Amino acid sequence: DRIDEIERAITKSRRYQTVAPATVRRLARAALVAARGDVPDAVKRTKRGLHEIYGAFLPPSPPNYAALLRHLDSAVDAGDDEAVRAALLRAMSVHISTRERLPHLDEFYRELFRHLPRPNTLRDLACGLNPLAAPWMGLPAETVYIASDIDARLVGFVDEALTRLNVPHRTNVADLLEDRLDEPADVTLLLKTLPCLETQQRGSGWEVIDIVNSPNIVVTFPTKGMFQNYSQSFESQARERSCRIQRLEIGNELIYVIQ
């Protein structure tokens, strides 16, 4: 009853109107217990929690996805590869995380796929605007891109972008802490995701790595003593499980390829 109330307020006329209901409800429940039953404060907690796991990386108000697509259409409808790339870089820049990787985008994916097999299916979890890269990924023509995140509009825009790029795909609104990860997929990307999962649920990071049905997994961490912190814990945790891993560092991103 009080959860629906919190949800209604979270239909945030601002930053959170389209966040996955599964996510709002999970955060709202814990917020209510933490708030001693007080809805207003529970609403505050939920919002602050949403900002930490999602809002912090996006604009104060919904991105102008219509303009971004417009520009993409112009490039594609003109058959100009340069314009398409430009329109994709501009779009990705709206999301803080993808923005951080753009300065080393080509190097990042060129190197990454040298340590991965040719994928039949690529899964991108907590994807953000990363799927807009890919023309940079040199994927086999038939590869199906499966992308998911916690906001319907963001994911919807990713779907439209992939459609314009003629990339076989399937997009969903999924919360890594609840939704299933049993679908088969050759490679799964978990770029700059673990730190956020840890903040929401201790130990969930490696739990996801453990259950995700993929023999190849990429886990990255942002480095901008951040490198120190992330590399030390992940590696000790990997060595504890005897996970075969290969480490790389491109741009401000620590990279681990898990087989």
When asked if residue 123 is in the footprint of ligand SAM (CB under 6 A), the reply is: no
Stretch that binds ligand SAM, among 4-12, 174-182, 206-214, 224-232 (CB under 6 A): 174-182
Which phi and psi (to 5°) does residue 169 adopt? -155, 170
Residues 91, 132: contact at Cβ < 8 Å?
A: yes
Token pair of 17 as six digits:
């109107």
Backbone angles phi, psi at 90, to 5 degrees: -60, -45
For ligand SAM, the binding residue among 130, 143, 171, 214 (CB under 6 A) is 130
3-state secondary structure at position 61: coil
Q: What is the H or E stretch that residue 190 is in?
A: strand 187-190
Is position 24 an interface residue for ligand SAM (rule: CB under 6 A)? no
Selected binder of ligand SAM within 75, 123, 175, 217 (CB under 6 A): 175
Pick 95 or 164: Cβ nearer ligand SAM: 95
Shortest distance (Å) from residue 89 CB to ligand SAM: 13
Residue among 191 and 254 whose Cβ is closer to ligand SAM? 191
176 annotated as belonging to a binding site for a ligand? yes
Q: Which of residues 52-71 bind ligand SAM (CB under 6 A)?
A: 53-54, 57
Shortest Å distance, C-beta 49 to ligand SAM: 10
Q: Give the nearest distance from C-beta 11 to ligand SAM in angstroms.
A: 17
The C-alpha atoms of residue 131 and residue 170 are separated, in whole angstroms, by: 11
Q: Interface with ligand SAM includes 112 (CB under 6 A)?
A: no
Helix runs in 123-174, H state only = 152-164
For 145-149, which contacts have Cβ atoms below 8 Å and span 24 or more sequence positions? 145/169, 145/170, 146/121, 146/122, 146/170, 146/171, 146/172, 146/183, 146/185, 147/123, 147/171, 147/172, 148/123, 148/124, 148/172, 148/173, 148/174, 148/179, 149/125, 149/173, 149/174
Stretch that binds ligand SAM, among 30-38, 43-51, 124-132, 209-217 (CB under 6 A): 124-132
Binding site for ligand SAM (CB under 6 A): 53-54, 57, 97-98, 126-128, 130, 149-150, 175-177, 191-193, 196, 200
Annotated binding site for S-adenosyl-L-methionine: 95-101, 126, 149, 175-176, 191, 200
